[PDB]
């Protein structure tokens, strides 16, 4: 949101960032610097193994659906141990070839169905994602991380509609009193506001 | 295989049909009298509905893919309580819009290594056929009905492959001993044949 001059801070940004399609490229790095998503493929390639070691292959599936390689993310549930799991990877392989098909035709309704009735918030997500394709169904409920969603709120959005969300989750956060919204609000007079809102929350 | 008149055996097979595409089809209603598969769809959808008030959602499923019913096998399939049986139902739902396709995009993959990983041979067989529309894969599987193998080869297959599966599996059972082989055989002194291999076998 910027704030002596706003050639001087995107001057110094630059050259904070020396070490596009938008017109404020700039502020999309630093919001990529600040919330530690700056990532190249050997990045998201090593963070995919290094939580295929963790366990959490369902989170290994949502990260590789938030980086937006699905046949990556695929792979990499499918070769799992779980039939459970091997099934849920089946059912996403779907879309692979069901990308053209505009059309109610069951497969996306059984998939909302159950996207709604899953437990695991990731597979919720990703089933979310996989049928009726919207990005706004991903980051808007509370059930993960909320560095997770703004990583898919700087990938892939518009400018116009990123301020809208920021503004959004911010004045959720601040008078909800969560912790996760020092992502947007730094360590900052709103942060001790919202430092203060979770104190009267929770002592 | 027939064998005083040809003229005065097909009359009285027709006759016999009277009573309640191809050169050999009295042949064929014979047979689907004698192995009782000559049902109506009403009654078809009446056998469904007793299937799962009895609670085997897979022999629902094996007998509507064995039908060719794929769409009204992913409406039963979904109507379950099982999350397993729902995942399974949403990986048989990507294949209306994907039969229209060649092979090698993961997802008939996925389905292969399914149907050689799973261990119900009903899902074993709905997964090897909608992966692969075939039915050599399904007529030679040793863990479903006889009767239900004889349906679908009398249903779908030409004359030539119904010769050569019927002679396979009528030579298999009649040196191995299965019970289920009578269906195929008869009592006749070949089923007596069979019942003596049986005995051979068992005591």
């Not at chain 1, 509609?161 to 007079?189: C, M």
């Not at chain 2, 598969?37 to 064995?66: C, P, Q, T």
């Amino acid at each position: 949101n910027g704030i002596l001059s706003d050639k001087q801070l995107n001057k110094e940004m630059e050259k904070i960032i020396k070490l596009a399609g938008s017109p404020k490229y700039v502020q999309r790095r630093l919001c990529l610097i600040i919330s530690g998503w700056d990532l190249s493929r050997s990045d998201y390639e090593d963070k995919y193994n290094i939580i295929m070691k963790n366990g959490h292959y369902e989170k290994a599936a949502a990260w590789a659906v938030f980086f937006g390689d699905i046949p990556k993310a695929v792979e990499i549930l499918g070769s799992a141990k779980k039939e459970r799991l091997r099934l849920i990877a089946t059912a996403i392989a779907g879309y692979l070839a069901y990308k053209d098909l505009p059309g109610n035709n069951a497969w996306r309704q059984q998939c909302r169905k159950m996207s709604s009735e899953l437990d695991d918030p990731y597979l919720r997500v990703i089933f979310a994602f996989i049928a009726d394709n919207d990005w706004w169904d991903i980051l808007y409920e509370p059930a993960i991380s909320l560095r997770e969603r703004l990583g898919v709120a700087l990938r892939f959005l518009n400018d116009t509609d990123l301020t809208t969300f920021l503004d959004r989750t911010s004045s959720t956060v601040i008078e909800n009193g969560e912790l996760e919204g020092l992502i947007l609000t730094g360590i900052t007079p709103n942060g001790i506001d919202l430092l203060q809102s979770y104190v009267n929350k929770t002592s | 295989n027939g064998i005083l008149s040809d003229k005065q055996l097909n009359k009285e097979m027709e006759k016999i049909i009277k009573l309640r595409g191809s050169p050999k089809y009295v042949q064929r209603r014979l047979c689907l009298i004698i192995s009782g598969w000559d049902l109506s769809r009403s009654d078809y959808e009446d056998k469904y509905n007793i299937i799962m008030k009895n609670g085997h959602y897979e022999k629902a499923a094996a007998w509507a893919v064995f039908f060719g019913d794929i769409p009204k096998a992913v409406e039963i399939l979904g109507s379950a309580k099982k999350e397993r049986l729902r995942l399974i139902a949403t990986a048989i739902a990507g294949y209306l819009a994907y039969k229209d396709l060649p092979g090698n995009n993961a997802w008939r993959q996925q389905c292969r290594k399914m149907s050689s990983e799973l261990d119900d041979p009903y899902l074993r067989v709905i997964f090897a056929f909608i992966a692969d529309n075939d039915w050599w894969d399904i007529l030679y599987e040793p863990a479903i009905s006889l009767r239900e193998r004889l349906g679908v080869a009398l249903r779908f297959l030409n004359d030539t492959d119904l010769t050569t599966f019927l002679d396979r599996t009528s030579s298999t059972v009649i040196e191995n001993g299965e019970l289920e082989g009578l269906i195929l055989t008869g009592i006749t002194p070949n089923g007596i044949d069979l019942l003596q291999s049986y005995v051979n076998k068992t005591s």
